[PDB]
Each structure stands twice: as structure tokens, then as C-alpha cells.
Amino acid sequence: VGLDQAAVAKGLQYFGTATDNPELTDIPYVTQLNNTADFGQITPGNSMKWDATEPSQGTFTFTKGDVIADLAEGNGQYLRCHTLVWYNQLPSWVTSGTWTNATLTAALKNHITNVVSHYKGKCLHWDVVNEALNDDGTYRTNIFYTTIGEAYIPIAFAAAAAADPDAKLFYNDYNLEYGGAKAASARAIVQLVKNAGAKIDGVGLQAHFSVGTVPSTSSLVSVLQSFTALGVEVAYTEADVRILLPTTATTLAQQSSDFQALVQSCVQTTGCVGFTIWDWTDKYSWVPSTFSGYGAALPWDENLVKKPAYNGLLAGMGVTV
């Protein structure tokens, strides 16, 4: 039994993975990325972001995004399209522009209409707005927030809904799994979009963790239910469990338990629709280039060989290992 087979047997829509264009020349890697027993869903890690899709104002480039979309379509995998609005990976014409509310609003809507229209009908989900919150649940400053104010959030959701009524529109963020101030502010963003009369269908919980900081399965279920209570779906969108190198048998076992708890929380929760890992092999993980001294965060090692966490994920989906 593979991870996606295990997931669908427990009522999830998918088990899936992010990938990135540079990795697709690695044939042993793509062979496993194309293994639909394990991966029912793909996220483009970078090539649908604003710097990749609109590198100058009004000029759209989809070649690299379409490689990932076409690979998912070729495999019959779902696509999570990622991400329209975010402080990071913006081109300089957005960050350095001389904007007014009106002109940046128009440029925002035009970006979203062009990208969402291009992929219309291809995207199970869109991450429409990514990481709009500071750690304390205030709004993260970015040029949209300083120019348009918090209205940029419902504006973005309304523009995506108009261009592709069939895509489920997500708000995506990290550290919501702890509850507290940041999760409360994520629920406030859901209510802001509903108050504005705009569509929002989901909250994405990225599930970037350091090993040993994942709470109990029941704690996670409670937090997921705090979002499904609002009438949105949830999903774990970018899961990884980073270890301060070097690894030991103890931290590999804790990593397995941590992944196991995360996927079982999704299995238990009505309205948690799926689970995505942020790539699948340590060879291509973002973690070392982001979290200094950390690594080995994923269920396959840098030689594409299963780690204990692969069986932890299966155990969290009720499979006898």
C-alpha cells in the first residue's frame, strides 16, 4: 500500500508532494514523483509564484508552471496551484513601484485574473493568499498591506473566484497548528473574507515543524476543527519535520511519530481533505537553505530510500507496517 492509496482508503482526497522544475532532470526522482500509489497530488514549489509568472507588469510567462501542471495531468494527480499573493518571491516592479490603492489594486486583480484564467479548471485548490500574519497574529507588512490595507485579502479571493469558480480558494500559513494568537487571526481572516461577501473554501496548515514540537493528535484535531467549524475545508499543505543535524535513531523515530500524528489528525477530522509534504526526499528539501543547521526533514533520504517516517505516515493512515 502506498501513501495515496492509504489516504484515499481513509476518506482523504489525496496524499501528495511539492516538486520544482530543476528536479525534473533527475530520472530516479521523477520515476518516484510519478508513482501514483504514493503521490495523488502535486504542488509547484516555485514556478506559479508572481516573480515566475509576471516578471514585468502585464507580461505573463507560464512555460515553467505549465511543465508542473502537465506532469500532474499526465499522471492523473490533482494540482494545488501555489501561490497568488505573498510577501516573498515578488518581482521588483511590484515591491519598488510608485503605487496608489487604486493602481496596486488593479495590478493585483490583473495578476490574479491572468494566472487563474490560464490554469482555469486545472487547479483543485489555489493558495490565494499566503502568510499574511506575523507570529503574534497582527498583519505581516508587505506592499499590498501598506498600499491597499487588509482589503487586499478579500480583493484577492474575489478576483480568483471570478476567474475560476471551480477552484477551492485557500488561505495558507504556518504555525497555525499551535492554536493561540496566530490561529485566532487566521480564523479572523476567514471571517473578514466572509464579511466582505467574497469566497473562501479552505485553510492550509503548512505543517513546517522542528522535530519534537508537534502536539498530540487530539490537540491537532481540535485546531483543525476550529477551522472546519467556520465552514471551510482544511489540508496540511507543506509538511516537513526538520532535525538539527546530525540525525540519530532517536530523532528519526521522533520524526516518524510527528508525521504519524499529523496525518492521523487529518484522517480523524471531517473536512480535512488531504496531506502534502514539501517535496518527498531530503535531496531536494528547502530546509537546509532556510533553517541553518537543520535538515533530513522528509520521509525519503537523499538516496531516495525510505526513512522510518514513511512507515509512520502509513501507521497514521491505519496501515499495518
Ligand SMILES: *[C@@H]1O[C@H](CO)[C@@H](O)[C@H](O)[C@H]1NC(C)=O
Ligand atoms: C513522469 O510523468 C510525466 C507525466 O505523465 C511524463 O511526462 C514523464 O515522462 C514521466 N517521467 C518518468 C521518468 O516516468
Ligand SMILES: *[C@@H]1O[C@H](CO)[C@@H](O)[C@H](O)[C@H]1NC(C)=O
Ligand atoms: C483601498 O480601497 C478599498 C476599496 O475601497 C478599501 O476597502 C480599502 O480600505 C482601501 N485602503 C486604503 C489604505 O485606503
Ligand SMILES: [K+]
Ligand atoms: K478527513
Ligand SMILES: [K+]
Ligand atoms: K527544492
